[PDB]
Design an enzyme around this catalytic site. Structure first.
Site, mmCIF file in Angstrom:
data_model
loop_
_atom_site.group_PDB
_atom_site.id
_atom_site.type_symbol
_atom_site.label_atom_id
_atom_site.label_comp_id
_atom_site.label_asym_id
_atom_site.label_seq_id
_atom_site.Cartn_x
_atom_site.Cartn_y
_atom_site.Cartn_z
ATOM 1 N N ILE A 20 -13.111 -38.059 -48.112
ATOM 2 C CA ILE A 20 -13.069 -36.715 -48.758
ATOM 3 C C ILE A 20 -13.128 -36.861 -50.282
ATOM 4 O O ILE A 20 -13.108 -35.829 -50.967
ATOM 5 C CB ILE A 20 -11.811 -35.927 -48.314
ATOM 6 C CG1 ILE A 20 -10.520 -36.613 -48.743
ATOM 7 C CG2 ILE A 20 -11.827 -35.658 -46.810
ATOM 8 C CD1 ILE A 20 -9.294 -35.788 -48.477
ATOM 9 N N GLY A 23 -12.531 -42.227 -56.640
ATOM 10 C CA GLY A 23 -12.690 -42.546 -58.056
ATOM 11 C C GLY A 23 -12.780 -44.041 -58.250
ATOM 12 O O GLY A 23 -12.909 -44.783 -57.222
ATOM 13 N N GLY A 26 -10.409 -46.390 -56.346
ATOM 14 C CA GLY A 26 -10.676 -46.678 -54.918
ATOM 15 C C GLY A 26 -11.066 -45.425 -54.143
ATOM 16 O O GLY A 26 -11.867 -44.626 -54.676
ATOM 17 N N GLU A 27 -10.504 -45.249 -52.936
ATOM 18 C CA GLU A 27 -11.031 -44.335 -51.888
ATOM 19 C C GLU A 27 -9.908 -43.427 -51.349
ATOM 20 O O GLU A 27 -8.759 -43.903 -51.195
ATOM 21 C CB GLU A 27 -11.659 -45.140 -50.749
ATOM 22 C CG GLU A 27 -12.669 -46.166 -51.213
ATOM 23 C CD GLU A 27 -13.958 -45.606 -51.814
ATOM 24 O OE1 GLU A 27 -14.390 -44.511 -51.369
ATOM 25 O OE2 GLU A 27 -14.567 -46.297 -52.690
ATOM 26 N N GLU A 136 0.626 -35.589 -47.427
ATOM 27 C CA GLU A 136 0.291 -34.258 -46.869
ATOM 28 C C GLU A 136 -1.162 -33.946 -47.187
ATOM 29 O O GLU A 136 -1.562 -34.180 -48.303
ATOM 30 C CB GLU A 136 1.111 -33.163 -47.510
ATOM 31 C CG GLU A 136 2.261 -32.690 -46.694
ATOM 32 C CD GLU A 136 3.117 -31.716 -47.482
ATOM 33 O OE1 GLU A 136 2.585 -31.141 -48.547
ATOM 34 O OE2 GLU A 136 4.316 -31.569 -47.121
ATOM 35 N N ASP A 179 -3.298 -34.897 -66.842
ATOM 36 C CA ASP A 179 -4.665 -35.047 -66.296
ATOM 37 C C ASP A 179 -4.910 -34.010 -65.219
ATOM 38 O O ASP A 179 -5.411 -34.379 -64.165
ATOM 39 C CB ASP A 179 -4.872 -36.446 -65.714
ATOM 40 C CG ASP A 179 -6.332 -36.774 -65.452
ATOM 41 O OD1 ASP A 179 -7.191 -36.254 -66.197
ATOM 42 O OD2 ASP A 179 -6.596 -37.508 -64.503
ATOM 43 N N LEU A 180 -4.529 -32.766 -65.464
ATOM 44 C CA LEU A 180 -4.511 -31.708 -64.431
ATOM 45 C C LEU A 180 -5.809 -30.923 -64.514
ATOM 46 O O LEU A 180 -5.750 -29.702 -64.746
ATOM 47 C CB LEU A 180 -3.282 -30.815 -64.626
ATOM 48 C CG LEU A 180 -2.928 -29.881 -63.452
ATOM 49 C CD1 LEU A 180 -3.136 -30.552 -62.130
ATOM 50 C CD2 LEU A 180 -1.494 -29.388 -63.565
ATOM 51 N N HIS A 181 -6.941 -31.604 -64.304
ATOM 52 C CA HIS A 181 -8.282 -30.970 -64.196
ATOM 53 C C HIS A 181 -8.345 -30.261 -62.860
ATOM 54 O O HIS A 181 -7.425 -30.459 -62.062
ATOM 55 C CB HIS A 181 -9.435 -31.987 -64.422
ATOM 56 C CG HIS A 181 -9.475 -33.139 -63.467
ATOM 57 N ND1 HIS A 181 -9.954 -33.017 -62.155
ATOM 58 C CD2 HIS A 181 -9.194 -34.452 -63.640
ATOM 59 C CE1 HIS A 181 -9.872 -34.187 -61.545
ATOM 60 N NE2 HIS A 181 -9.422 -35.087 -62.439
HETATM 61 C C1 LIG Z 1 -7.060 -32.908 -49.169
HETATM 62 N N1 LIG Z 1 -6.022 -33.678 -49.834
HETATM 63 C C2 LIG Z 1 -6.170 -34.560 -50.829
HETATM 64 C C3 LIG Z 1 -4.925 -35.049 -51.121
HETATM 65 C C4 LIG Z 1 -4.627 -36.032 -52.158
HETATM 66 C C5 LIG Z 1 -3.306 -36.403 -52.457
HETATM 67 C C6 LIG Z 1 -3.078 -37.270 -53.515
HETATM 68 C C7 LIG Z 1 -4.168 -37.716 -54.246
HETATM 69 S S1 LIG Z 1 -4.171 -38.774 -55.621
HETATM 70 C C8 LIG Z 1 -5.893 -38.661 -55.747
HETATM 71 C C9 LIG Z 1 -6.472 -37.855 -54.807
HETATM 72 C C10 LIG Z 1 -7.923 -37.508 -54.772
HETATM 73 C C11 LIG Z 1 -8.833 -38.158 -55.590
HETATM 74 C C12 LIG Z 1 -10.174 -37.859 -55.462
HETATM 75 N N2 LIG Z 1 -10.658 -36.967 -54.587
HETATM 76 C C13 LIG Z 1 -9.771 -36.341 -53.807
HETATM 77 C C14 LIG Z 1 -8.413 -36.563 -53.868
HETATM 78 C C15 LIG Z 1 -5.461 -37.302 -53.889
HETATM 79 N N3 LIG Z 1 -5.692 -36.491 -52.842
HETATM 80 C C16 LIG Z 1 -4.069 -34.388 -50.235
HETATM 81 N N4 LIG Z 1 -4.730 -33.554 -49.447
HETATM 82 NA NA NA Z 2 2.277 -28.440 -51.880
#
Ligand SMILES: Cn1cc(-c2ccc3scc(-c4ccncc4)c3n2)cn1
Ligand code: NA
Length: 328
Positions: A20, A23, A26-27, A136, A179-181
């Site tokens: 999904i 960066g 990693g993945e 989650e 870093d809240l883009h």
């Molecule tokens: C749908 N979903 C993504 C999460 C999540 C949680 C922590 C983190 S820390 C970095 C990412 C992220 C980075 C790049 N592309 C998607 C998510 C991330 N994604 C939880 N639910």
């Molecule tokens: Na939440």
């Protein structure tokens, strides 16, 4: 000690993985365990190989994200400073192994349909350490919802949820996200009509408009308990402050200016900058299914434009939440 990939990701869980996210770090995969979606971030650590064109992080360098993820997760269970507007951390593992062939399969499908900037992670030996952070499922990020949000009253709920969450983190932990883009704001249908937070012992509610915000990705984030500061020192970095094309890359420069490039210091103003940037994205680069046609909806729209126009004169998310007319 470490554990084989099979400890976090037994066959069934590993088989249901769809990629999904990505960066340089990693993945990120999504899978289902006990009928529940979860998100897996996988980070190669300690290795000599470049990954996606950068050196792997040491264990020491990955601890900050682990600690901050844990602390923000634990806020959902606290009393004086309680919020659910960060992302639940289910678990953290140190894993050893070459990359599961079934994650390569999921990685390929993503690369075909959507295209990836990343090296195929098929070059890791059986002594490769990773960190697996299981979160989650928070839903889909603000960027990929440009066109999907219903009214502008929804944007209010979001800014309110975001402001409340950061305020509770400021009060609890002297927290800056940093870093809240709009990639780092996830949204999620909820049946709940009112959402609940507690700030310094005072409980209030926010109308959801049936969405639940989750702030993610604590990679650049800072906080402290009893005078121990956890952060990312980026005083000796160029690329971060050189970017442009987006208001985003100004916020890095504006943070460095605010904190004098001393990143261990608490500058809760950084949270205001990001909320402004988010508010900006709401009024410019966001486009809604229903525009603001009717009277009381345009009174919401003015109050947000008024928010965009004034919020940069507030010293903290706490200051915003408590003193700003948008939230009265
Ligand atoms: C749908 N979903 C993504 C999460 C999540 C949680 C922590 C983190 S820390 C970095 C990412 C992220 C980075 C790049 N592309 C998607 C998510 C991330 N994604 C939880 N639910
Ligand atoms: Na939440």
């Amino acid at each position: 000690g470490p554990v084989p990939f099979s400890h976090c990701l037994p066959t069934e869980k590993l088989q249901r993985c769809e990629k999904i996210g990505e960066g340089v770090f990693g993945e990120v995969f999504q899978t289902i365990a006990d009928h529940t979606p979860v998100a897996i971030k996988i980070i190669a650590i300690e290795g000599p190989d470049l990954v996606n064109g950068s050196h792997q992080k040491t264990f020491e360098e990955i601890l900050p994200e682990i600690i901050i993820s844990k602390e923000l997760s634990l806020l959902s269970g606290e009393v004086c400073n309680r919020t659910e507007g960060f992302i639940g951390l289910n678990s953290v593992h140190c894993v050893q192994g070459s990359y599961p062939p079934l994650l390569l399969k999921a990685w390929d499908h993503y690369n075909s349909t959507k295209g990836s900037a990343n090296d195929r992670p098929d070059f890791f030996k059986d002594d490769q350490l990773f960190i697996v952070l299981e979160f989650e499922f928070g839903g889909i990020d603000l960027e990929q919802m440009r066109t999907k949000l219903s009214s502008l009253a929804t944007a209010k709920s979001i800014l309110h949820q975001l402001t409340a969450s950061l305020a509770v983190a400021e009060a609890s932990l002297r927290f800056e996200h940093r870093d809240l883009h709009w990639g780092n704001v996830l949204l999620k249908k909820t049946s709940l009509k009112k959402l609940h937070y507690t700030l310094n012992g005072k409980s209030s509610t926010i109308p959801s408009c049936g969405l639940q915000v989750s702030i993610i990705d604590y990679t650049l984030s800072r906080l402290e308990r009893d005078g121990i500061v956890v952060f990312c020192d980026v005083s000796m970095d160029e690329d971060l402050f050189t970017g442009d094309g987006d208001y985003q890359f100004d916020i890095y420069r504006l943070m460095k200016k605010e904190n004098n490039n001393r990143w261990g210091e608490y500058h809760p103003y950084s949270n205001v900058l990001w909320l402004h940037y988010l508010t900006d994205k709401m009024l410019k680069q966001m486009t809604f299914k229903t525009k603001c046609n009717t009277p009381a909806m345009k009174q919401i729209k003015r109050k947000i434009q008024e928010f965009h126009r004034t919020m940069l004169n507030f010293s903290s998310a706490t200051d915003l939440l408590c003193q700003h007319s948008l939230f009265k």
